[PDB]
């Protein structure tokens with residue numbers, strides 16, 4: 118299987134996953150020279166993000182990240198098709214180099230990055246069918262930096278203790294996923310790109326919010342140190358750290374912004 | 379048939395060149411979390427770098443960078459063996475994006491990068507032999523920013539038109555190679571890494587000088603429009619632009635600095 122380190126690391130993904138060496142690869146550096154204001158980029162509307170407190174949602178350690186399954190009535194309104202949620206998950210660095218976002222801004226990482234994955238439910242029945250198809254996916258990316266304690270992110274992080282090892286699963290009671298989004302979600306970067314993980318299909322409409330969220334030093338350290346990418350009984354355990362892809366070349370292309378200011 | 383762009387680009391190099399997916403890969407981003415001062419890193423001495431103006435040195439297109447062959451009596455003093463020079467070459471961007479260094483510093487690219495490749499001549503008869511042996515090679519890297527015209531670099535750039543296509547060769551009169559190095563060569567970054575091109579052997583002792591040199595906008599444009607990766611008669615010409623590898627993960631590796639700060 119693929120990993121972020123050693124022989125099955127990202128320089129080797131294209132051997133079993135040819136799209137990882139093809140066009141439109143993500144993530145990318147978002148820097149001034151390639152930004153272009155596009156007045157067409159109006160605010161997204163987040164529908165069904167207030168998940169029933171009476172429902173429980175599956176949290177899984179899948180050996181690559183921690184993922185929370187989301188219901189298909191949750192969706193984004195404002196794009197060419199309805200894009201329905203399927204899962205969220207995170208990417209981070211490590212305590213010695215706590216700079217593990219996937220996208221960078223003017224060459225700089227953030228501490229971590231949250232992805233809320235949606236699929237084109239007008240065209241496809243589910244995210245696995247959509248993922249390799251034209252206009253299949255839309256991902257929202259939130260950049261995460263260290264700062265004040267974030268009660269909303271703790272609604273996920275308080276369960277990490279139950280998903281410590283690969284394959285493990287816990288349930289999270291519904292809460293308002295919109296609380297994980299930053300201020301002024303009207304301000305965002307938008308470009309066409311790819312999954313940042315195998316099979317790297319170039320099927321993702323990216324929206325990366327301009328403003329980061331904050332979590333505390335303790336929360337960031339918790340995320341960096343809670344999980345393993347190996348099964349519980351593995352005699353050679355490995356910590357799940359540095360689970361981000363390096364930035365990809367992006368030449369003669371623009372990233373559109375909904376802000377000029 | 380490896381390239382820097384498209385289907386045979388750097389995410390695919392490991393399909394033919396396994397070490398490109400292995401450990402110790404270069405280049406890297408030099409940033410504070412991975413730096414450590416090392417007082418044992420004393421100044422290098424550059425011996426036989428003042429090449430006779432009455433002698434000439436072969437410049438060649440190899441379809442990857444322009445390389446200038448260097449004589450083996452040119453060498454570095456100060457490492458744990460004598461390292462004798464073999465060649466120098468460059469990496470650069472393109473006219474519309476002059477940001478093609480390989481190493482970055484705190485997430486920023488420089489305009490271009492000069493590599494002066496040396497091999498351990500105490501142990502090996504030639505750089506090719508050395509290149510697949512541990513610490514077989516020592517490369518000096520100079521970061522190049524856009525600035526003032528540089529007459530010394532122009533001693534190379536003025537000959538580019540005789541080496542416009544793959545396989546072409548030209549002769550460059552000797553000059554003092556030390557004129558290509560920056561100020562305060564005593565301050566450098568040192569780490570164990572790899573070739574930045576196929577076959578990506580993890581056999582380089584890297585020294586990246588702290589301080590950049592300048593070349594002008596017109597010199598960068600000349601360099602970025604002078605060369606092709608393809609033969610003269612190729613019916614599908616490809617410009618030699620953007621010939622730099624993305625930075626590589628580097629964790630549980632430190633970069634040692636000969637400067638505190």
Ligand SMILES: NS(=O)(=O)c1c(F)c(F)c(S(=O)(=O)CCO)c(F)c1F
Pocket residue numbers: 203204232233234244245248254256311312313314321
């Ligand atoms: N990092 S990323 O947001 O690019 C990304 C993933 F990591 C990811 F795992 C999926 S996926 O929803 O698992 C594919 C459908 O089965 C994605 F669809 C996806 F887009």
Ligand SMILES: NS(=O)(=O)c1c(F)c(F)c(S(=O)(=O)CCO)c(F)c1F
Pocket residue numbers: 493495505506509517572573574575576577578
């Ligand atoms: N730009 S770089 O300096 O790291 C570099 C290479 F990438 C590189 F491949 C070689 S190489 O030793 O000629 C090829 C070995 O078969 C080099 F010699 C070399 F110096």
Ligand SMILES: [Zn+2]
Pocket residue numbers: 206207208232313
């Ligand atoms: Zn992701």
